[PDB]
Symmetry: D2
Subunit: 512 residues, 4 copies
Amino acid sequence: QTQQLHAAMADTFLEHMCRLDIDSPPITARNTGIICTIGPASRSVETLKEMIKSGMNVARLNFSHGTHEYHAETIKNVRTATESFASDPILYRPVAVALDTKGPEIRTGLIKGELKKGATLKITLDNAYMEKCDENILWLDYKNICKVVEVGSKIYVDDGLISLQVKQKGADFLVTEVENGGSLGSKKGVNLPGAAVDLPAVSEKDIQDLKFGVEQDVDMVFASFIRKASDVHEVRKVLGEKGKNIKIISKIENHEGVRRFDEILEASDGIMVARGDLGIEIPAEKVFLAQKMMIGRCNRAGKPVICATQMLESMIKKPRPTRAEGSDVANAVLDGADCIMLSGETAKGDYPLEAVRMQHLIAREAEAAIYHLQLFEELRRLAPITSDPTEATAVGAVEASFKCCSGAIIVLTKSGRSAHQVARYRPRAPIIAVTRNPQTARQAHLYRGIFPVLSKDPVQEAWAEDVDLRVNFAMNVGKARGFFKKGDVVIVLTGWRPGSGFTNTMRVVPVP
Amino acid sequence: QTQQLHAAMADTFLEHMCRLDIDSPPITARNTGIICTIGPASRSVETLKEMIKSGMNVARLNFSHGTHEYHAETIKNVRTATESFASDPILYRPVAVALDTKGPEIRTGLIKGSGEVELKKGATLKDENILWLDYKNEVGSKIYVDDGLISLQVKQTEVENGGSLGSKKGVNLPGAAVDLPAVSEKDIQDLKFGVEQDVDMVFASFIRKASDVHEVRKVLGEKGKNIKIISKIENHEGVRRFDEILEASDGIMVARGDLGIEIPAEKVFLAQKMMIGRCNRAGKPVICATQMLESMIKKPRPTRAEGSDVANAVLDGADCIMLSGETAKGDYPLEAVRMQHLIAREAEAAIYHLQLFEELRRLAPITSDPTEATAVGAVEASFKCCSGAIIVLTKSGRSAHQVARYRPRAPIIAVTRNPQTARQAHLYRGIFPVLSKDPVQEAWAEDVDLRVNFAMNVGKARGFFKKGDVVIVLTGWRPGSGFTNTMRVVPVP
Amino acid sequence: IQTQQLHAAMADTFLEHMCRLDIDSPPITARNTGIICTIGPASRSVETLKEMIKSGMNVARLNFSHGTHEYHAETIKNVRTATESFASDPILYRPVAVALDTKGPEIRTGLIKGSGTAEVELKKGATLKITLDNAYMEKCDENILWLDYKNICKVVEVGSKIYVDDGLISLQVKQKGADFLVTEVENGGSLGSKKGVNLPGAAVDLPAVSEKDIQDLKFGVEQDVDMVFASFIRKASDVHEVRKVLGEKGKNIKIISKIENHEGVRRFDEILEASDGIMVARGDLGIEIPAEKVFLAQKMMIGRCNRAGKPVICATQMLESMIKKPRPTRAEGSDVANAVLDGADCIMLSGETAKGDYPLEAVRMQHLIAREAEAAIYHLQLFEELRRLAPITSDPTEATAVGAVEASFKCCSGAIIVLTKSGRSAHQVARYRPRAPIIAVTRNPQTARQAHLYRGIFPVLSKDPVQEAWAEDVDLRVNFAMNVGKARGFFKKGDVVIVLTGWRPGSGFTNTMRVVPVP
Amino acid sequence: IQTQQLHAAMADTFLEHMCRLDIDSPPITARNTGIICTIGPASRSVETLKEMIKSGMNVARLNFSHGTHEYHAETIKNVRTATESFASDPILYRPVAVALDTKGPEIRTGLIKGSGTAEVELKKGATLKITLDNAYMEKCDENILWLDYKNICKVVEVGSKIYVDDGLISLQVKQKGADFLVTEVENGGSLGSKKGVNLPGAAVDLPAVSEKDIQDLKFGVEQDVDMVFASFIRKASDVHEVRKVLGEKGKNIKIISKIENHEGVRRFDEILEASDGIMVARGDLGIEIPAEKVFLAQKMMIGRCNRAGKPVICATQMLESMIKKPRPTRAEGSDVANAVLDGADCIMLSGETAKGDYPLEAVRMQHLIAREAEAAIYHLQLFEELRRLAPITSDPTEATAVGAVEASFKCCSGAIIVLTKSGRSAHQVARYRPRAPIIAVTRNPQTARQAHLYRGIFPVLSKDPVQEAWAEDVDLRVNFAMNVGKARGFFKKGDVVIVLTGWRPGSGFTNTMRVVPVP
Ligand SMILES: [Mg+2]
Ligand SMILES: [Mg+2]
Ligand SMILES: [Mg+2]
Ligand SMILES: [Mg+2]
Ligand SMILES: [Mg+2]
């Protein structure tokens, strides 16, 4: 009559559905990470504090817009708000900082320093009109556009609002017919579905933004418009040695990214289902197919996946989501998404706090509604037989956690790897990852179920006593957070020697 | 490389997900019914005609608003639009008419006799201080006003969420076992009006117990005994007593609008999947309703969440999906219908039929009913040969419904001479009803043949299959069987 | 419930299915696994053959690695005399198939003191001589053993092991002459006439089809046998050679390849693809390969035959102790039941009926065990796996067949009635392994006899004249099946059965499935 | 992938798992199924028992039907002399359990011509007089048979069937006297001394514990036996009486209930709850109930024992023909393999080792078959179903045990090493049926011997002194287990093993799993 445990015992998925119970309350622990895009509505320290309290785990900075000065101040405010809670190591929550690249974006020029259906529109590459745009002349930044489009090509403007069809293709210009009508502003996004755009994966702009991210000690990079594995390698190369620990999340936003997903996933640390641009590049009715394919393959490969964009779109103006938006968040969790994201809802909307609180509430309910019986069985069957002791330890810990309905899986980890390997098998119980590495604690939010706790206690002289100290630290946090209490059973993962790579010990212990 | 047939062969659901292919186009036939609420934006004959072309199968009239004259004119326009195609039974599409009752609604009064006060959080409400309600019959309980806009807690009330309060607004009592009658005097008038207007189904609002369903059915009387009663589950009590409600009903609507105010909004998806699962298990139609494409009221394209919501409702197992404001008052009713059509077809191909068909059979009883065995045998044959359609001759629809309960991939072309049977068939996933108007032939074998060839001609014209394809045909074995018990696997002539 | 292990049938796991098996849950009347009996001195008379048919014999096996053509002709006449003794009642008449077991590249001994039934008792440590002198081919005794492998001394050496009669007696070559061998008995035992000799690891060079086999195979065609059990099939080319000898008139004779050695197991897939069926010939197999590996080969071959939809026979030593005892051992009871649970279409008796003291009891015991084991099958998993492992088809009869089996499970039908001329339609139903018996109505006598090769097919031979109105001819044959099922106790009026028929006269057009209450 | 049927292990269906079984895929060295051998004249000497231990014997089963306690004490001493002959090498020492079979409500005949090993040949149709006159208790012959059930003339009539020696000989009462019966032997056979007598359908009211059993059981406690095989257990109260006779001094002796008649099968659930394990005693069972139903009772009982996590023994006539022949029949090879596939913890040999001509060959054959069948288990389905049928628990050892088995599958572990005092921790691992052997390290000699009751448990008895530092004591026992599988060929460097220990010295708190590469 708890955590949908009655539905958990069903021998079929259909009966599992039939047993879902609105009167079965979920656990306190929320496993799905919440990523919030920071903007004018959420930039202040005071609002950022409320965002952390409401459930924000990752702050997303969109380098689509804004100077390095602007984003540096945003990062300072995020850390000021985050460290405001540092006086309580028990209740302190690490907050990651993510850098979303601009990438190969196509943007229009400045209007004069209403498009109508059927009219003719010239697309100019001459910079003398880079700010002199009007209903008859439109300047764009893609200099080699005439080489990659034809008279049959479609051109979309302003997040798919305006549709254009090339009617005559020149060498330095394009003539199009308006398939919309509508109102065009300045520096709007342009989409070229099906076209083989030859813009660099890492532009000159992308190079300094990524180097700025390395300088500012960001935790992850959301790389826009990844089209092939070599694109990912370029991003990782730009990050270099100093950036080698930054997680690379490839954003799949167009047809080519979907077709080359397998090679992209193998080269990346994770994936974002960037449904905003994806829904303009492919038919909107096919987006759920691409979303479920990518989440499935990420679960199968054991790499984090983010579901993004328009999840609670109506809350930009309203304090409540629609029923479809509630369903979308829950189904993304049921699909298997490690993280869910808010864009305009937190960047510019009128109710950023309510949007964060809503994603937290829905995620907790959906996590309990997961059919773990089938999921764990299928994840194990699709994962290979290994000789890695940590991998065998991880699956034994998850199986043990199901057998005793443990309150938590406690994992000591330096790099996060040991905890990621547990999360890959999707236990119902939260994974309390104890680390002294602040970046590991922040990066842990990318992975479903990992509740990172940052130990700041000095290293104890006896290593066995230092390990014990950190295990007891996890117990105290879990009890204070209400994840479990004394007498409950938890599973504890440690290694046989100091350092990374040696997690091989599972203990089933009552909580002291 | 079509209809996600690669994903269909996966040995696990996880691998089935991994194999979903945006470049795998679906079949032409769309199996999920589309229910459109008719209103000012969709009331004209010409608009209703275009909605039929765009995919509308059921016209829903919401009797929470409007006079009998207004709805009678709406019904007349629907029948005028529907009957435009009656001169060609091959291309004629039956369109059902549904009556959504007002039900036990609680409504406030008029603001100081007029037709707004601004309530402030923490204030007392018991004008801005005086609130009258029409519900004539504890502390800490929650009372919500105007589609959940204002929240109040009984203190001995205190405003929990403030807002601008109008006149005669709906009131919701979450968790309360309200004792209002299931059928009000207004509901009796509307239901008898529905009987006179020959409606096909009733969407009964705020059904709270099995006895509520029986009370509705009694009002429909003798002529209405064949009208399908769909119980709308909209509050906590309906969810808790769902099982007795389902067995007493002909179908279920997940009325997520009111449900999301009566129970925490983050719990609605649990109730939806529970109800669709139990309806799938019982073989009774289930409707997913409300705010599925809400943004399309003002925009020609839906949000990413709205596309997911429609697709996941089909994957859940919903027989029908519904549009309310999107078609009743929105600016893009045709685009909303067309979008539900497109998404449903893509989602229908993405169903994991291997597990679904296996689990539906394991959860269905061993029976001695020859038609139940015939239906499951026909669905198995349809999967084995990838048939273009399952053709079913039926008078009441029962034989076709029994096929639909086992959820074949192929469309079910149900041939009937009963117009009400054809219209009501839209409640069941996959049933494409066609109304034969040819006279009954003296030789019974030729009457069956006449109707089978009618189905062949319909499928060819609709693009469901062509000559040479393989279909399954369910008929009877003799004149006056009374039961469908004959399955034939035949090439299309 | 409380019948045909229907409680165990509803279990969500195979383990719980095991836990629910109930010795007090009686099976149905219908027995689905065919019983093949080897005919010999103990079972040759018309009167005994009549009782063998009554006790459950479906196929009579004649082993042509022993006996003359005249001798076997009289046996065939006796089998058909006994079979046609029941012809005066077409409702209760049971077709009985005749099987021809080839000699193949077998090494066979001679006659003990001029008789095929005599035996001598070999004792441990004694000396035995193997001679190739054809003067001793019928003068075998405790001191002299003649065999037919002329090049035997070229492939054996001193200390080598030679086994006789399915590995029963082991002999060690002690001296190697040019045309003879003298041996020592390592384990004692009692040796009969024309027994098999096994040389494991020896490169035996005998042809797959000998000159004797050509004569025997043509004799089977002349005598209108229903199937050929081809001994020691080692490769697909062996099967093709046999099929060529069978010619055009034998094109309808089912070719069952016997897998008896290492090569047959390793090349099983190409052998199965070329054959009509398979016999797990465990007698020779259990000495040619390690005895502890035979169950692996058996379950592999039964599994692959089930997967391909071709009949598979489990054979030899199933009830071996009943050659001398009226009740079997516990291992023998388990062996028969597990062969059925493995998925074997037919089970076989060799010495138990050919020469044993209790041939009727052995047939009855296989009948009793088979019926109990068939109810104990976990049909829920089996039908599910057969369908997932079977391809999507364009054959209307294949889709009709799988739909009929699903319907049979859904309504727990008393039978699936199938009208068929060649048997194919009934075979396609049997491949999906319904619990209900498949009553195959045919006017083709060979189709009726050959149907015993397929699990669950109860053949009935209609002798009524072909009716002019084809709809009335179909009804005539369907009602004939109703009459048989009622008389046999498979169902009664009010029960539900499934009926498979065609849309037109001829073979190949089964496409109509009806779920009908029994009239 | 070409070893231990790992290709078949990966199949998505049981049908495909069967299809992939490969006679050319060799199993691992470790054999998981325990082998129980009944000791008798053929296996009583110290020298023979030493060869039996090397061939694979894990448990010596003693039936005290003849001889004084002094005679049986010498048998026990001889077993332990043979067992301790290998003690000079703790690496290769194998613990050997001793089992005691109660007489129970058994009816037993007398001595053939004064000897326990003499036999007479009964012939079909002859007359055999059954007498209760004690002057013939040791004077049995082909014409006079004495048995110990004094009330036999009260419970049979003229025409009744009387079976002797597990149904081998059948007799029909032709005349009844006050204290004698004149019977006719229906089938002939060889009649030995002190054979069991079965009276199917007779209302025998004999006690669960006879007076002979009271003396023998306390003698067994004095002789430090490890387990008791209680005959003809019919209800839970029967088990309680056995445990009461064992008393406090015997409280650690495991009681294995033998199910041998209808009531034991029908009341199985209450018997299992009161017992430490179950023996499927198919000898008496196959004559008390219809022989065609025995496989149902066997698979039901093994399934329910697997579900409960209690040992189950499959017994009797598994290799019956090997009493006289050096090679088993094909049915006997199948029976042993299918008992392992069913899920039996132990398989047993009775006459094959007690009196047969080839006791060593019988032991080696059970070892060979068991190893092959263990690789052929469909672990994917078995582990899934064992977990689904086991409840969610709060016991840390249960969660640790299932996590260790899952880890053993994930890395294809060479072994699961378990430190245990009472055996419970190792028993809890065995309940989830890992493919890898369970090396249970104990200092308790009785725990080591009793561990043979559980599938997969390879017991090793540490005799090294207890170390002051507990971490060194755990290390000593863990690496001792390494050295054994190391030397036995169970694994080599690069393989992965799973190690189960506790957090401190004590009993009941096994909660630590370590995944370590083999040094
Ligand atoms: Mg960006
Ligand atoms: Mg984008
Ligand atoms: Mg409502
Ligand atoms: Mg042979
Ligand atoms: Mg016994």
